[PDB]
Amino acid sequence: IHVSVVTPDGPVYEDDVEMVSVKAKSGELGILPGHIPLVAPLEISAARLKKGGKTQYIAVSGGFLEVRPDKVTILAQAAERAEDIDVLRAKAAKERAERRLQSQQDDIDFKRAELALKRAMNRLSVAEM
Amino acid sequence: ASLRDIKTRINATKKTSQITKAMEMVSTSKLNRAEQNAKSFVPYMEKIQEVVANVALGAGGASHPMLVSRPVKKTGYLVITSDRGLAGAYNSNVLRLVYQTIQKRHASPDEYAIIVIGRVGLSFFRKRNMPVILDITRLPDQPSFADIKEIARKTVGLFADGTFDELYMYYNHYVSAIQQEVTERKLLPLTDLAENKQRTVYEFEPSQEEILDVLLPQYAESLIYGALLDAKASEHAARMTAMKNATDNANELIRTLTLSYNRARQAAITQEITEIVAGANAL
Amino acid sequence: PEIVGEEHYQVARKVQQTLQRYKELQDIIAILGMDELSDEDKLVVHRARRIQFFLSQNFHVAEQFTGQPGSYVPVKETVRGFKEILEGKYDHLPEDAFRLVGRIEEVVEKAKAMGV
Amino acid sequence: PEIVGEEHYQVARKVQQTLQRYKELQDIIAILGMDELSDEDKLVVHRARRIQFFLSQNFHVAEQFTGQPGSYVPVKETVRGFKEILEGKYDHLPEDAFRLVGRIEEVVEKAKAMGV
Amino acid sequence: GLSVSRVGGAAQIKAMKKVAGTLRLDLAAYRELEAFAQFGSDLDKATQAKLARGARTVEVLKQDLHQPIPVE
Amino acid sequence: GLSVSRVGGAAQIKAMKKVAGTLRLDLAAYRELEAFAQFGSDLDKATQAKLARGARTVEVLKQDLHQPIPVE
Amino acid sequence: ALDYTIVVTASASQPAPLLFLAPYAGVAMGEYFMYKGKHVLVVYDDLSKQAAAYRELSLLLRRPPGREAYP
Amino acid sequence: ALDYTIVVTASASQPAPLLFLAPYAGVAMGEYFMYKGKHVLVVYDDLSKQAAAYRELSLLLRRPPGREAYP
């Protein structure tokens, strides 16, 4: 029935959509409810959710398809929603700069407190009773 | 016994107690966010475990090189340490168990290769002169998937070249906030596998082989990232426990130094009053 | 060195150097523990516990206190013993094997009586 | 401010605040370096060094030792000089040319003599 | 934290008596945590709100010379 | 560090001033930076080179017993 | 503020008994208006100096000293 | 136990001279049975009270004291 796009970071788009037409590495696919349990490795492309009257594009990087007759499950590693494929390579570099400055910040926030603790232990070593 | 020196030593150990208490609260908040990140990773992991079980356990599937155990000419090692210190027995236990399992059963530097995660393990295996073939460092406190993803695909593709022939993981398992159990988990070949008590047969759209060739590196990367998040959670919890014990040791030092302070205070006042009354008796 | 000898003097001053370095670390060990020492200070603490316990000795007078018969150690024997400890020959033995022991042969027989 | 006035009190208090904020980053600059601090605290250490070297004078009694004649600096001109350094008018002038000068026009003349 | 008035509470008008009792608690919660406030995003609303209200309490309680403020 | 010479500089010869004015700076930098090398993560390469220069400074300043060295 | 205050001064150049008797002159000038029904504020700047002056007088009068030679 | 025990008491309200001579009274009572060939147990409940009482008596004799003002 319903599609569920997940990521190791967290679930992205869970809705109630009856038509998905994601491209596998063999070729096109088309999924309606009552479908056979089918397994497909997804190419770097967008999945088309076009059952709510208007289409809904969701991009996958890495990408893997597990369709049940009960539900549709997409195992993705990057699941951007704007889904014009250049925006995934743009958001990857944007969050790359973000996680680089975050990894610098999480190191300096440790080292400042570590200098405070080292000087405070130095004062005990100098005091020496 | 030099009352002013005892007072300055009391003030210095009070300030160390304050700094270690602030570090305990910072690492407690980081442990909370690490548990939230692991709970975010949980459903992807259970779904990839379900799919890999239902595919690799049915209709043979042992033709792939990651299921069947090839003969062992080398052994890979994926060691997960911390980038930063002030965790007590985190890196010591992990690197000690890795050093014991390497020096126990190989006795040759060409029979193994080590992939470290963390500056502490990297400095460990460069002090001990061991190969550190894949060596990324400087991870955030709550790490995302891409930064471990590139070293994870390099690890899996370095297995797929025929180099490792097997590899293991070493990380601290976060159970509840005080133990941090050291685990040796065999990463791959994926011999140890179990179905989810009920199975449904699948239709393979390209073939079974191409689906395994895409799926099994992703399952190995998901295992690596799950062990990495679990090790980061145990890192924040071990630093929390270490700073709590530092506060307790600082407070015990405070109370013994205040006992000695009161002794020196009484001795100082009785000394000065004996001096003054002796000088008054002198006249 | 002109009174006792060069090697005795070197061993005695190196014992005093390691014990002073272990005395300067007791605040870090007492608060932060043995975990943050930078892998040479761990070696200093590890050898200095062994040295501070191997300085202890059973007496003939203390046989009425414990029952252990007591020992008499020549100077060359204890200089060779502390030189073997400072070289790291007995890093694999437990530190409570050095308590109240005359010679390092007696250290080794006590440590294999313990189980090591 | 009832004795020195409002402007002198505010400029002196802000000089004390930036020099006290500078004597909290001393271990951080000495260990972790300048590249890692922030682009908001390095402005603080920037103006702190420009203030800390402008606190020094050439003396009249040091004329026989260095050849520089020495200066008597009134209170209004030094309050104006530290106010102009706190506002940021002299950030483009180097770390020297504040060294051993009387007024802030002497800073301008010495920085033009240095080529800047 | 170290200053005390043993009469005090009976030495206030009722308007100050209604209001100063929680400013005492705000200063206690701030002076306990001001040595902990240098680094870290500790808690979202349990410690940052205490530090914010206490850091504004310190700025409220400052005066200049020769300007006595009336009671109201 | 604690030892003071209040005549100092007028007591030294002109060679010893030129040579020891940076000896004091290197030993003071080593005494200040040794305090952060007791425990902890590590220090970067520049002040570790400073620590190496200071360790060799300490090894220079050691003497033996009753062996005075001429100033040249 | 000088329309309603009284200033009692015993400075450091003054002899130690004037230092000693300044606070008692303060209460003796306050108790007049206290027993006339009025409300008085009396401020003692550095009673520790008055204590040191009474210590000085008791030691020069050779009274037996106690702690820190205060009588 | 009162078939073989002797109780020598000097309580807190008694003056320090009687506190000074309480254990010596106990040993002078024990020496009789000691030098007659018998065995005696003697218990001194808080000799630190005797030390404080002799410290009192020596300070009232105006003897110059040592550390913790004990003579």
PDB file of N, CA and C in Angstrom, chain F residues 28-61:
ATOM      1  N   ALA F  28      62.206  29.681  30.541  1.00  0.00           N
ATOM      2  CA  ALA F  28      60.910  30.146  31.029  1.00  0.00           C
ATOM      3  C   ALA F  28      59.769  29.592  30.189  1.00  0.00           C
ATOM      4  N   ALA F  29      59.965  29.514  28.867  1.00  0.00           N
ATOM      5  CA  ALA F  29      58.967  28.901  27.997  1.00  0.00           C
ATOM      6  C   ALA F  29      58.812  27.416  28.293  1.00  0.00           C
ATOM      7  N   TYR F  30      59.915  26.730  28.604  1.00  0.00           N
ATOM      8  CA  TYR F  30      59.821  25.316  28.955  1.00  0.00           C
ATOM      9  C   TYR F  30      59.115  25.105  30.288  1.00  0.00           C
ATOM     10  N   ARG F  31      59.406  25.949  31.284  1.00  0.00           N
ATOM     11  CA  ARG F  31      58.719  25.864  32.570  1.00  0.00           C
ATOM     12  C   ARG F  31      57.230  26.164  32.441  1.00  0.00           C
ATOM     13  N   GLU F  32      56.851  27.068  31.536  1.00  0.00           N
ATOM     14  CA  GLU F  32      55.432  27.360  31.364  1.00  0.00           C
ATOM     15  C   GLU F  32      54.716  26.282  30.556  1.00  0.00           C
ATOM     16  N   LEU F  33      55.378  25.684  29.567  1.00  0.00           N
ATOM     17  CA  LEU F  33      54.723  24.714  28.701  1.00  0.00           C
ATOM     18  C   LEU F  33      54.852  23.274  29.184  1.00  0.00           C
ATOM     19  N   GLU F  34      55.692  23.001  30.186  1.00  0.00           N
ATOM     20  CA  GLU F  34      55.764  21.664  30.762  1.00  0.00           C
ATOM     21  C   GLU F  34      54.514  21.336  31.568  1.00  0.00           C
ATOM     22  N   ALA F  35      53.799  22.359  32.037  1.00  0.00           N
ATOM     23  CA  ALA F  35      52.606  22.189  32.854  1.00  0.00           C
ATOM     24  C   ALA F  35      51.453  21.539  32.105  1.00  0.00           C
ATOM     25  N   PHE F  36      51.442  21.622  30.780  1.00  0.00           N
ATOM     26  CA  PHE F  36      50.402  21.016  29.967  1.00  0.00           C
ATOM     27  C   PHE F  36      50.838  19.694  29.355  1.00  0.00           C
ATOM     28  N   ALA F  37      52.066  19.258  29.623  1.00  0.00           N
ATOM     29  CA  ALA F  37      52.581  17.987  29.139  1.00  0.00           C
ATOM     30  C   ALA F  37      52.580  16.912  30.216  1.00  0.00           C
ATOM     31  N   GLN F  38      51.894  17.146  31.335  1.00  0.00           N
ATOM     32  CA  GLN F  38      51.861  16.166  32.413  1.00  0.00           C
ATOM     33  C   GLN F  38      50.902  15.029  32.085  1.00  0.00           C
ATOM     34  N   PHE F  39      49.702  15.367  31.625  1.00  0.00           N
ATOM     35  CA  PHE F  39      48.721  14.394  31.172  1.00  0.00           C
ATOM     36  C   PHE F  39      48.042  14.973  29.937  1.00  0.00           C
ATOM     37  N   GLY F  40      46.967  14.334  29.504  1.00  0.00           N
ATOM     38  CA  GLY F  40      46.141  14.880  28.449  1.00  0.00           C
ATOM     39  C   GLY F  40      46.450  14.275  27.098  1.00  0.00           C
ATOM     40  N   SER F  41      45.849  14.884  26.070  1.00  0.00           N
ATOM     41  CA  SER F  41      45.925  14.349  24.716  1.00  0.00           C
ATOM     42  C   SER F  41      47.334  14.389  24.137  1.00  0.00           C
ATOM     43  N   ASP F  42      47.801  15.594  23.785  1.00  0.00           N
ATOM     44  CA  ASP F  42      49.117  15.921  23.228  1.00  0.00           C
ATOM     45  C   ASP F  42      49.244  17.420  23.006  1.00  0.00           C
ATOM     46  N   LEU F  43      50.431  17.852  22.599  1.00  0.00           N
ATOM     47  CA  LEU F  43      50.683  19.212  22.158  1.00  0.00           C
ATOM     48  C   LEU F  43      51.195  19.163  20.722  1.00  0.00           C
ATOM     49  N   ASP F  44      51.011  20.258  19.983  1.00  0.00           N
ATOM     50  CA  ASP F  44      51.403  20.272  18.579  1.00  0.00           C
ATOM     51  C   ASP F  44      52.923  20.403  18.436  1.00  0.00           C
ATOM     52  N   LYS F  45      53.399  20.457  17.187  1.00  0.00           N
ATOM     53  CA  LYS F  45      54.822  20.243  16.926  1.00  0.00           C
ATOM     54  C   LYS F  45      55.685  21.431  17.340  1.00  0.00           C
ATOM     55  N   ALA F  46      55.126  22.646  17.332  1.00  0.00           N
ATOM     56  CA  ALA F  46      55.920  23.836  17.626  1.00  0.00           C
ATOM     57  C   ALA F  46      56.308  23.897  19.100  1.00  0.00           C
ATOM     58  N   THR F  47      55.331  23.784  19.994  1.00  0.00           N
ATOM     59  CA  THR F  47      55.700  23.816  21.399  1.00  0.00           C
ATOM     60  C   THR F  47      56.288  22.495  21.883  1.00  0.00           C
ATOM     61  N   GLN F  48      56.136  21.397  21.136  1.00  0.00           N
ATOM     62  CA  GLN F  48      56.955  20.221  21.424  1.00  0.00           C
ATOM     63  C   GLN F  48      58.415  20.445  21.056  1.00  0.00           C
ATOM     64  N   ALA F  49      58.688  21.213  19.995  1.00  0.00           N
ATOM     65  CA  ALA F  49      60.067  21.614  19.728  1.00  0.00           C
ATOM     66  C   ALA F  49      60.585  22.545  20.816  1.00  0.00           C
ATOM     67  N   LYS F  50      59.702  23.399  21.346  1.00  0.00           N
ATOM     68  CA  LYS F  50      60.051  24.231  22.499  1.00  0.00           C
ATOM     69  C   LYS F  50      60.365  23.380  23.729  1.00  0.00           C
ATOM     70  N   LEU F  51      59.584  22.317  23.954  1.00  0.00           N
ATOM     71  CA  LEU F  51      59.845  21.399  25.062  1.00  0.00           C
ATOM     72  C   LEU F  51      61.146  20.632  24.874  1.00  0.00           C
ATOM     73  N   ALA F  52      61.491  20.284  23.632  1.00  0.00           N
ATOM     74  CA  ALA F  52      62.762  19.612  23.371  1.00  0.00           C
ATOM     75  C   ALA F  52      63.945  20.537  23.633  1.00  0.00           C
ATOM     76  N   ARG F  53      63.842  21.796  23.184  1.00  0.00           N
ATOM     77  CA  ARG F  53      64.860  22.802  23.487  1.00  0.00           C
ATOM     78  C   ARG F  53      64.987  23.031  24.989  1.00  0.00           C
ATOM     79  N   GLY F  54      63.868  23.001  25.711  1.00  0.00           N
ATOM     80  CA  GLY F  54      63.931  23.193  27.151  1.00  0.00           C
ATOM     81  C   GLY F  54      64.501  22.001  27.898  1.00  0.00           C
ATOM     82  N   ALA F  55      64.222  20.786  27.418  1.00  0.00           N
ATOM     83  CA  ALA F  55      64.820  19.598  28.018  1.00  0.00           C
ATOM     84  C   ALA F  55      66.328  19.586  27.816  1.00  0.00           C
ATOM     85  N   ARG F  56      66.786  20.020  26.641  1.00  0.00           N
ATOM     86  CA  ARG F  56      68.224  20.136  26.438  1.00  0.00           C
ATOM     87  C   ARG F  56      68.817  21.311  27.209  1.00  0.00           C
ATOM     88  N   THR F  57      68.021  22.349  27.482  1.00  0.00           N
ATOM     89  CA  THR F  57      68.455  23.435  28.360  1.00  0.00           C
ATOM     90  C   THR F  57      68.706  22.931  29.779  1.00  0.00           C
ATOM     91  N   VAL F  58      67.766  22.135  30.299  1.00  0.00           N
ATOM     92  CA  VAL F  58      67.907  21.518  31.618  1.00  0.00           C
ATOM     93  C   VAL F  58      69.119  20.592  31.656  1.00  0.00           C
ATOM     94  N   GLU F  59      69.345  19.829  30.583  1.00  0.00           N
ATOM     95  CA  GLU F  59      70.509  18.945  30.551  1.00  0.00           C
ATOM     96  C   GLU F  59      71.822  19.710  30.416  1.00  0.00           C
ATOM     97  N   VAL F  60      71.804  20.900  29.810  1.00  0.00           N
ATOM     98  CA  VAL F  60      72.996  21.745  29.817  1.00  0.00           C
ATOM     99  C   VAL F  60      73.285  22.239  31.227  1.00  0.00           C
ATOM    100  N   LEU F  61      72.266  22.767  31.913  1.00  0.00           N
ATOM    101  CA  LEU F  61      72.458  23.424  33.208  1.00  0.00           C
ATOM    102  C   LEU F  61      72.846  22.483  34.352  1.00  0.00           C
TER     103      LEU F  61
END
